[PDB]
């Protein structure tokens, strides 16, 4: 089968700037009839894939001509002359010259924006949950940029690594930021044994860790 | 309007089989090839096979011969794909598409895609989620605005549906992808509003889990 290699794996571009993606094949994609069946698809976050280009350089109906494609043989390139927010997603080249049709691994295009410091919120366990004998402490770290961030939980000054569940959103189309959620789960008994619960983040926007905490007690 | 609508998420026992459907409308079903594509862990697409409904003519990627069987009902404009003897590698999202390549013209018309059908191969039991409201105290962001949350945990399998105030509240909502841990998923969503709205106006988390016929609403009480 033909192996399709795409590079880069990820590209971060500012709106208004150009972007180019490469796709290389293990065998020439020139068919015996002289045509080259190389297509480019875009899969936007949470959407099905959509074809942008067919026959190497031909744009599909309704696709902006800011996008162009070129290449031949085993080397192809997709170029966006000027990036717009709507271009965020994963781009794939897929060949149909040789059977079976094979796709490249994809290239994620990320919109590069100004650094944004996280807005962190912390929530102690709900009464409902405690009733069931469980206790989850939740921390939301919303709208930050770059995506790179490290969060650690600390209970009474000591780091807690067991029982942590993290989840991140993909880049937001509205403001180009990322959001993350970190949930620390314990038993109700252990939760009621400690005092301070701290959610601590390490991000580019600060020389010191970003902290959010609460102390549980009575009254 | 060309439209391809696929069947719902499937939870399947190892070694068994499923039949996925792709209902089409808006065009002459018998005149275009319908292709099926597979996607594992996001970036990881594979071409399965294609069928020409007009004749029943099919072509399969060698890898899937014996795994996939394509058929098409002309009377209902519905294409089907049966997957046999399911295994771990079969857990994926499957798409049907009226790709658009017209062989006689050596050119393409617009491609239309179904929304995808997620298949989970597992012997695990269907479990209803526990929904917990997250009223702040420290995660209040102080004045100006405040963020609330909703914790959905301990369910299987995906998916779960989460909305705020019946969908009437979508601006400032972040719903995090579910994470599996110990055979059960956990999902959370936050919503940020102005100090003026909450607690003055009620904010409610709506959750639905089709697999267990669960539907719950949790009001965020201070
Ligand atoms: O090389 C060999 O071994 C034999 C070659 C025989 C292949 C014949 N080739 C064709 O008919 C051209 C079809 C080109 P195509 O762009 O429609 O291919 C596709 C089709 C569906 C796709 N999708 O993603 O759905 C992706 C690519
Ligand atoms: Zn060939
Ligand atoms: Zn050949
Ligand atoms: Zn201690
Ligand atoms: Zn101590
Ligand atoms: Zn302690
Ligand atoms: Zn020509
Ligand atoms: Zn064309």
């Amino acid at each position: 089968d033909i192996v399709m290699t795409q590079s880069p794996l990820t590209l971060s571009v500012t709106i208004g700037q150009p972007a180019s993606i490469s796709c290389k094949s293990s065998q020439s994609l020139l068919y015996s009839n002289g045509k080259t069946y190389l297509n480019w698809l875009l899969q936007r976050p949470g959407q099905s894939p959509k074809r942008l280009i067919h026959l190497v350089s031909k744009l599909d109906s309704g696709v902006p001509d800011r996008i162009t494609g070129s290449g031949s043989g085993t080397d192809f390139t997709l170029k966006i002359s000027r990036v717009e927010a709507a271009d965020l997603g994963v781009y794939y080249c897929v060949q149909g010259t040789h059977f079976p049709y094979t796709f490249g691994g994809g290239t994620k295009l990320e919109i590069l924006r100004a650094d944004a410091a996280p807005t962190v919120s912390i929530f102690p366990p709900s009464s409902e949950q405690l009733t069931s004998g469980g206790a989850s402490v939740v921390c939301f770290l919303n709208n930050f940029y770059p995506k790179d961030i490290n969060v650690k939980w600390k209970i009474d000054g000591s780091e807690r690594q067991n029982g942590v569940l993290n989840s991140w959103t993909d880049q937001d189309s509205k403001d180009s930021t990322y959001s993350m959620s970190s949930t620390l789960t314990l038993t109700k008994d252990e939760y009621e044994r400690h005092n301070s619960y701290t959610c601590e983040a390490t991000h580019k926007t600060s020389t010191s860790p970003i902290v959010k905490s609460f102390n549980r007690n009575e009254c | 309007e060309m439209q391809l609508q696929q069947s719902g998420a499937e939870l399947l026992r190892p070694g068994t089989s499923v039949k996925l459907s792709c209902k089409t409308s808006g065009y002459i079903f018998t005149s275009y090839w319908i292709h099926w594509v597979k996607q594992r862990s996001g970036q990881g697409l594979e071409w399965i096979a294609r069928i020409y409904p007009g004749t029943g003519s099919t072509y399969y990627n060698e890898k899937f011969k014996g795994k996939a069987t394509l058929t098409a009902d002309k009377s209902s404009s519905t294409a089907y794909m049966q997957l046999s003897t399911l295994k771990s590698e079969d857990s994926a999202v499957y798409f049907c598409t009226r790709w658009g390549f017209i062989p006689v013209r050596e050119d393409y018309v617009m491609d239309y895609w179904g929304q995808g059908t997620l298949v989970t191969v597992s012997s695990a039991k269907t479990t209803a989620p526990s929904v917990y409201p997250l009223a702040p105290v420290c995660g209040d962001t102080t004045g100006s605005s405040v963020t609330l949350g909703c914790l959905v945990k301990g369910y299987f399998p995906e998916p779960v549906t989460l909305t705020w105030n019946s969908g009437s509240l979508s601006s400032g909502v972040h719903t995090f992808p579910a994470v599996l841990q110990s055979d059960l998923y956990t999902l959370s969503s936050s919503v940020t509003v102005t100090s003026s709205t909450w607690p003055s106006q009620s904010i409610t988390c709506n959750v639905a889990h089709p697999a267990s016929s669960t539907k719950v609403d949790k009001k965020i009480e201070p």
Side-chain angles (χ1 to χ4, degrees), chain B residues 112-124:
Chain B
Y112 284 95
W113 297 66
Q115 81 280 22
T117 296
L118 178 78
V119 171
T120 302
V121 179
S122 190
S123 59

Side-chain angles (χ1 to χ4, degrees), chain B residues 2-221:
Chain B
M2 307 280 294
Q3 287 183 273
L4 305 215
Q5 286 140 28
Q6 297 183 69
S7 42
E10 293 278 1
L11 167 59
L12 299 148
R13 302 306 166 204
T16 66
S17 63
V18 241
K19 192 169 77 159
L20 305 188
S21 62
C22 171
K23 180 186 178 53
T24 79
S25 62
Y27 74 98
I28 304 168
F29 183 65
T30 51
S31 307
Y32 297 90
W33 283 91
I34 285 197
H35 305 229
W36 287 83
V37 172
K38 175 190 182 178
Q39 177 162 50
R40 276 177 68 74
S41 43
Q43 305 186 14
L45 294 165
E46 278 190 284
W47 181 80
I48 302 167
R50 56 187 231 249
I51 184 173
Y52 188 78
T55 68
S57 178
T58 70
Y59 287 78
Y60 298 84
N61 176 334
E62 191 65 38
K63 294 187 46 158
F64 301 89
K65 287 181 183 184
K67 172 103 303 177
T69 292
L70 308 196
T71 59
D73 191 2
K74 296 193 269 190
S75 46
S76 57
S77 297
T78 305
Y80 300 92
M81 176 174 65
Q82 184 199 334
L83 290 165
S84 309
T85 316
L86 301 159
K87 289 183 188 175
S88 315
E89 300 77 16
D90 298 319
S91 290
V93 175
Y94 295 86
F95 296 99
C96 60
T97 171
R98 188 210 66 169
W99 176 247
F101 179 58
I102 310 301
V104 73
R105 306 273 98 77
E106 280 297 352
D107 209 348
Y108 304 64
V109 295
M110 192 170 159
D111 55 309
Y112 284 95
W113 297 66
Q115 81 280 22
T117 296
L118 178 78
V119 171
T120 302
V121 179
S122 190
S123 59
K125 187 203 120 207
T126 289
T127 309
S130 290
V131 184
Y132 304 124
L134 311 174
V137 62
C138 317
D140 50 0
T141 312
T142 311
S144 194
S145 67
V146 300
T147 102
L148 314 177
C150 196
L151 180 62
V152 190
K153 59 175 304 187
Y155 67 94
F156 191 86
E158 269 281 82
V160 141
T161 287
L162 188 330
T163 65
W164 288 100
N165 284 359
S166 304
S168 291
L169 185 47
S170 55
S171 33
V173 170
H174 287 112
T175 301
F176 305 89
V179 174
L180 177 71
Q181 200 185 311
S182 278
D183 299 293
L184 295 169
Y185 291 96
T186 298
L187 176 148
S188 62
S189 179
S190 61
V191 65
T192 308
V193 297
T194 62
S195 312
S196 323
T197 3
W198 196 77
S200 318
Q201 300 186 350
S202 54
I203 302 294
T204 300
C205 174
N206 320 119
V207 182
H209 184 231
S212 58
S213 295
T214 300
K215 184 35 169 279
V216 293
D217 305 88
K218 276 293 188 297
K219 195 166 178 296
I220 312 306
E221 301 286 352

Side-chain angles (χ1 to χ4, degrees), chain A residues 7 11 28 53 55 61 63 69 74-75 82 87 102 119 122 135 142 151 164 177:
Chain A
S7 67
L11 26 29
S28 162
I53 297 175
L55 296 172
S61 314
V63 179
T74 59
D75 289 76
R82 163 172 50 81
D87 303 339
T102 54
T119 292
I122 193 168
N142 288 312
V151 325
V164 179
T177 63

Side-chain angles (χ1 to χ4, degrees), chain A residues 37 39 94 96-99 101 103, chain B residues 35 37 47 97 99 101 108:
Chain A
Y37 303 96
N39 310 285
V94 51
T97 294
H98 306 290
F99 197 90
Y101 315 142
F103 295 77
Chain B
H35 305 229
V37 172
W47 181 80
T97 171
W99 176 247
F101 179 58
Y108 304 64

